[PDB]
RNA sequence: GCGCAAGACGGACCAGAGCGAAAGCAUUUGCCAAGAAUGUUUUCAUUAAUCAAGAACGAAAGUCGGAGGUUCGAAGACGAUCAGAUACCGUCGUAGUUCCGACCAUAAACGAUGCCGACCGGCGAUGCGGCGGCGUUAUUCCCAUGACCCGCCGGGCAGCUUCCGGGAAACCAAAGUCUUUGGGUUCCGGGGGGAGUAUGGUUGCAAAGCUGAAACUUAAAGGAAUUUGGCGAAGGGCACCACC
């Protein structure tokens, strides 16, 4: 790898539909605090809401669908 | 096992004198060693550069091919090789419910430069036209193609490469084709899409320094 | 491998041919003429499973490695030359071109003109497969 | 029984047309029978266009588009969710689905 | 059985009976 | 990335558009012959329609003799898949695929709908030729030609609607003008199998093509449409006797 990626803390703005085979995960529109202009979509697993901060280990991936 | 990029030299390329932006970029080649020389390795190199990066304020969907032929020390001197249009513009011009016209010649300049030209013409819908198709008959297409062929022929046999490249920087041939073909069937998108080069004469240095100053 | 040129005033250009089929992606960087090359890592180089060699992850890692090598040698500005498998097979680019381009732009370089150079045939030979196609 | 006024194609006074090849498949389908789809797309999506624009030499640069024509066989088009079956009284609708978005 | 392969088997029986008839002359 | 060589093909433009008796036909230019429709106050004057015998053309595959063989690819050689897989899938690959010269006359050769002629509703477009009319353009004036616009006429590929009418219905402006049954003419079918089979003749180098039965056996085989049901069919929702 030879890459120590810095961790990113990001805050959600809205909750999209629940993807997955059995609906275990959901899609959110999440935005960063260090740059409050960049907004990406992520697939998050677990009970989420509007306002919780997610710890992203990488910030350069875009959300895949259920398959 | 050794780094092969430690024995490279960064050269520079220069456009010929009819272009505004003289400096294009940097290309690199290995150092001279024995029989092979860095002068020969920069010989057959063709550069695909856009017109917007070689001129100041013109169309961005035009590209010119430049090939090096001699080097004078950290400066590669180029010459005109070919012309082509960008793929997105050529694909966006071609649309359904219109017919497109192709013509080509094998016209030769006043020196030993044999060129092959290509162009294109698409039919124009009128402003108050209610009809959808607006096609062209075969005899009108033949007359328009002959008109295009003679306009291609008339602008090249009395010129050499310099002022015909100066004419190829705008679409003056395209405007002349569109103006001349208005009495046959009105066209609206006429661009010289491809210029090739078949035959090249013996290499003369004097014309190269006259083409660079 | 050093160069005494200016860096603040202008930038050094190269071109990058991104070839992306449905089973492998290529990130190939040459000079302006294209004869001399700089670096290449394929999408099968990063992931060790040959199932998802055309994955966005492997294209992202390959583009990041290519950008790191290009910053190591000293290429800052880059012209994108996009190509699919072409021919008579298909013309849609594979599933790593956009991810590789976004990873290459996000790495901290400058992007010039994006060009599609996939080979478009003018009625070439017969496509591989029968008259009924590949039934499966 | 006869299902359609035409024969699933657009041949009326010809008798023979040139065949084309499917893109998802390799079946030899006639040109006027195959479901054609001219799709236009940008090189980047709506998420990466900002990342391309912030890392561009030219300010106010127009992103190019990608032009490709797709030829589909009937089973390939119905299995890729391009066209589906509909009612007997709704089969004679000629207009495409609306271009709202 | 579809008519195509029954016609093919019928033609093979034609070939066998024709060969047997012409070799039993 | 720069060049060389070989063969095949003519994308996008390309359409419920055109031509041809059908099979079929898509780069540019040149040569030769042919054809439909439109226009005609031209010419002959019944020369016409359909067709046993006979005759030309005729997809792909197949045969014989040459040149050439890029790609694809029957037979074949393997690798997976599977209980088996001499199948689907993947890598090679012979005849063939291409051209010339000579053969067969076969397709779901389908509009599954013979040809000529007459009559019976409406509408909007389309390709050709001719005619008329306000305006715009090939830069400002006039005329003619091209390009638009509004209409008429004839032929042609077609479309929408219809208590015309028909039909078992699907549907058809013909599949209508049919018990109120007769415009002219050629071919062809009498329940389902045996069977396009036996034999005879005939054509072909061959593969095969045309003509074409009977014994025996059977009470059904089929066409259109409605309801249920089940789809490894599609579109919406639900269930901890389903899942996460």
Swiss-Prot record, chain A:
The gene it comes from is RPS28
In Swiss-Prot or TrEMBL terms, this protein is called: Small ribosomal subunit protein eS28
> Where Phosphoserine occurs, residue numbers?
39
Superkingdom in the source lineage: Eukaryota
Q: Which residues form a coiled coil?
A: none
A GO biological process of this protein is: cytoplasmic translation
| Family membership | Belongs to the eukaryotic ribosomal protein eS28 family.
Its quaternary organisation is: Component of the 40S small ribosomal subunit. Part of the small subunit (SSU) processome, composed of more than 70 proteins and the RNA chaperone small nucleolar RNA (snoRNA) U3.
CDD domains reported in the protein's UniProt record: S1_S28E
Q: Which GO terms describe its molecular function?
A: structural constituent of ribosome
Source organism per entry reads Oryctolagus cuniculus
Q: Which GO terms describe its cellular component?
A: cytosolic ribosome; cytosolic small ribosomal subunit; nucleolus; rough endoplasmic reticulum; small-subunit processome; synapse
From Swiss-Prot, chain B:
- Name the GO terms of the biological process aspect: cell differentiation; translation
Which cysteines pair up through disulfides? They are none
UniProt keyword DNA damage present:
no
- Gene Ontology terms: cellular component: cytosolic small ribosomal subunit; nucleolus
Coiled coil residues, start to end = none
Q: Where in the cell is it found?
A: Cytoplasm; Nucleus; Nucleus, Nucleolus
Question: What keywords are annotated for this sequence in UniProt?
Answer: Acetylation, ADP-ribosylation, Cytoplasm, Differentiation, Isopeptide bond, Nucleus, Phosphoprotein, Ribonucleoprotein, Ribosomal protein, Ubl conjugation
Q: What does this protein do?
A: Component of the small ribosomal subunit. The ribosome is a large ribonucleoprotein complex responsible for the synthesis of proteins in the cell. Part of the small subunit (SSU) processome, first precursor of the small eukaryotic ribosomal subunit. During the assembly of the SSU processome in the nucleolus, many ribosome biogenesis factors, an RNA chaperone and ribosomal proteins associate with the nascent pre-rRNA and work in concert to generate RNA folding, modifications, rearrangements and cleavage as well as targeted degradation of pre-ribosomal RNA by the RNA exosome.
Q: Which residues carry this modification: N6-acetyllysine?
A: 14, 36
Q: Does the UniProt entry include the keyword Repressor?
A: no
Name of the protein in question: Small ribosomal subunit protein eS1
Q: What is its main location?
A: cytoplasm
Reproduce the UniProt comment on modification after translation.
Answer: ADP-ribosylated at Tyr-135 by PARP1 in presence of HPF1.
One GO MF annotation is: structural constituent of ribosome
- Residues of crosslink Glycyl lysine isopeptide (Lys-Gly) (interchain with G-Cter in SUMO2)? 14
Q: What is the lineage of its organism?
A: Eukaryota, Metazoa, Chordata, Craniata, Vertebrata
Q: Which family does it belong to?
A: Belongs to the eukaryotic ribosomal protein eS1 family.
Q: Which residues carry this modification: ADP-ribosyltyrosine?
A: 135
From Swiss-Prot, chain C:
What intrachain disulfides are recorded?
Answer: none
For this UniProt entry, the molecular function terms from Gene Ontology, in alphabetical order, are:
structural constituent of ribosome
Q: Which residues carry this modification: Phosphoserine?
A: 1, 124
GO annotation, biological process: translation
Q: According to the lineage, what is the superkingdom?
A: Eukaryota
Localization (cell): Cytoplasm; Nucleus, Nucleolus
Its GO CC terms? cytoplasm; nucleolus; small ribosomal subunit
Keyword annotations from UniProtKB, A to Z: Cytoplasm, Isopeptide bond, Nucleus, Phosphoprotein, Ribonucleoprotein, Ribosomal protein, Ubl conjugation
Annotated region described as Disordered, given as residue ranges: 116-136
Residue(s) of cross-link: Glycyl lysine isopeptide (Lys-Gly) (interchain with G-Cter in SUMO2)? 46, 48, 91
> Which Gene3D superfamilies does the UniProt record give?
Ribosomal protein S11
Q: What Pfam families does the annotation carry?
A: Ribosomal_S11
Q: Where are the compositionally biased (Basic residues) regions?
A: 127-136
Q: Which residues carry this modification: Phosphothreonine?
A: 118
Where it mainly occurs, coarsely classed, is cytoplasm
Q: What does this protein do?
A: Component of the small ribosomal subunit. The ribosome is a large ribonucleoprotein complex responsible for the synthesis of proteins in the cell. Part of the small subunit (SSU) processome, first precursor of the small eukaryotic ribosomal subunit. During the assembly of the SSU processome in the nucleolus, many ribosome biogenesis factors, an RNA chaperone and ribosomal proteins associate with the nascent pre-rRNA and work in concert to generate RNA folding, modifications, rearrangements and cleavage as well as targeted degradation of pre-ribosomal RNA by the RNA exosome.
> What does the subunit comment say?
Component of the small ribosomal subunit. Part of the small subunit (SSU) processome, composed of more than 70 proteins and the RNA chaperone small nucleolar RNA (snoRNA) U3.
Its family remark reads: Belongs to the universal ribosomal protein uS11 family.
HAMAP family the record matches? Ribosomal_uS11
- Name the record gives this protein: Small ribosomal subunit protein uS11
From which organism does this entry originate?
Oryctolagus cuniculus
Swiss-Prot record, chain D:
The record ties this protein, via Pfam families, to: Ribosomal_S26e (PF01283)
PROSITE patterns in UniProt: RIBOSOMAL_S26E
Keywords on record: Cytoplasm, Endoplasmic reticulum, Phosphoprotein, Ribonucleoprotein, Ribosomal protein, Zinc
Q: Where in the cell is it found?
A: Cytoplasm, Cytosol; Cytoplasm; Rough endoplasmic reticulum
List the transmembrane segments.
none
Do the record's keywords include Transport?
no
Q: Name one GO cellular component term.
A: cytosolic small ribosomal subunit
* Compositional bias of kind Basic and acidic residues: 86-96
Taxonomically, which superkingdom? Answer: Eukaryota
The GO terms this record gives for MF are:
mRNA binding; structural constituent of ribosome
GO terms classed as biological process? translation
Q: Which residues carry this modification: Phosphoserine?
A: 53
Q: What does the entry list as the binding residues for Zn(2+)?
A: 22, 25, 73, 76
Among Gene3D superfamilies, the record links this protein to: Ribosomal protein S26e
Has UniProt tagged this entry with the keyword DNA-binding?
A: no
Q: Which family does it belong to?
A: Belongs to the eukaryotic ribosomal protein eS26 family.
Enumerate the PANTHER family for this protein.
40S RIBOSOMAL PROTEIN S26, SMALL RIBOSOMAL SUBUNIT PROTEIN ES26-RELATED
Quaternary data: Component of the 40S small ribosomal subunit.
Annotated function: Component of the small ribosomal subunit. The ribosome is a large ribonucleoprotein complex responsible for the synthesis of proteins in the cell.
Q: What is this protein identified as?
A: Small ribosomal subunit protein eS26
The protein's organism comes out as: Oryctolagus cuniculus (Rabbit)
Gene label: RPS26
């Amino acid at each position: 790898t030879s890459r120590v990626q810095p961790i990113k803390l990001a805050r959600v703005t809205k909750v999209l539909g629940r993807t997955g085979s059995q609906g275990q995960c959901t899609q959110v529109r999440v935005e960063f605090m260090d740059d409050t202009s960049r907004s990406i979509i992520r697939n998050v697993k677990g009970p989420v809401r509007e306002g919780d901060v997610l710890t992203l280990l990488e910030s350069e991936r875009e959300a895949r669908r259920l398959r | 096992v050794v780094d092969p990029f430690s024995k490279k030299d960064w050269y520079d390329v220069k456009a010929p004198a009819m272009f505004n932006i003289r400096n294009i970029g940097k290309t690199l080649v290995t150092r001279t060693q024995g029989t092979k020389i860095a002068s020969d390795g920069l010989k057959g190199r063709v550069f695909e550069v856009s017109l917007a990066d070689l001129q100041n304020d013109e169309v961005a969907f035009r590209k010119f091919k430049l090939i090096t032929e001699d080097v004078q020390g950290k400066n590669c001197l180029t010459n005109f090789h070919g012309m082509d249009l960008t793929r997105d513009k050529m694909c966006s011009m071609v649309k359904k419910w219109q017919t497109m016209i192709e013509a080509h010649v094998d016209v030769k300049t006043t020196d030993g430069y044999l060129l092959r030209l290509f162009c294109v013409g698409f039919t124009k819908k009128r402003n108050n036209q209610i009809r959808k198709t607006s096609y062209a008959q075969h005899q009108q297409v033949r007359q328009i193609r002959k008109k295009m062929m003679e306009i291609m022929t008339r602008e090249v046999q009395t010129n050499d490469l310099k002022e015909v490249v100066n004419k190829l920087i705008p679409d003056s041939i395209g405007k002349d084709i569109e103006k001349a073909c208005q009495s046959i069937y009105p066209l609206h998108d006429v661009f010289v899409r491809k210029v090739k080069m078949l035959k090249k004469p013996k290499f003369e240095l004097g014309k190269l320094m006259e083409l660079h100053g | 491998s050093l160069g005494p040129q200016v860096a603040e005033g202008e930038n050094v250009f190269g071109v990058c041919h991104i070839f992306a089929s449905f089973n492998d992606t290529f990130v190939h960087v040459t000079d302006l003429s294209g004869k001399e090359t700089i670096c290449r890592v394929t999408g099968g180089m990063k992931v060790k499973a040959d199932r998802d060699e055309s994955s966005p992850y492997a294209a992202m890692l390959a583009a990041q490695d290519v950008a790191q090598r290009c910053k190591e040698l000293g290429i800052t500005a880059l012209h994108i030359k996009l190509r699919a498998t072409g021919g008579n097979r298909t013309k849609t680019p594979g599933p790593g071109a956009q991810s590789a381009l976004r990873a290459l732009a996000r790495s901290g370089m400058k992007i010039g003109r994006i060009e599609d150079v996939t080979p478009i045939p003018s009625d070439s030979t017969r496509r591989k497969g029968g008259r009924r196609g590949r039934r499966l | 029984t006869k299902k359609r006024r035409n024969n699933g194609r657009a041949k009326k006074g010809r008798g023979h047309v040139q065949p084309i090849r499917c893109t998802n498949c390799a079946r030899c389908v006639p040109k006027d029978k195959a479901i054609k789809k001219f799709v236009i797309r940008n090189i980047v999506e709506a998420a990466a266009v900002r990342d391309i624009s912030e890392a561009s030499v030219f300010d106010a640069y127009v992103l190019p588009k990608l032009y490709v024509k797709l030829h589909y066989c009937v089973s390939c088009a119905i299995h890729s969710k391009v066209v589906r079956n509909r009612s007997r009284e709704a089969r004679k609708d000629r207009t495409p689905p609306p271009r709202f978005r | 059985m579809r008519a195509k392969w029954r016609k093919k088997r019928m033609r093979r029986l034609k070939r066998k009976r024709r060969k047997m008839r012409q070799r039993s002359k």
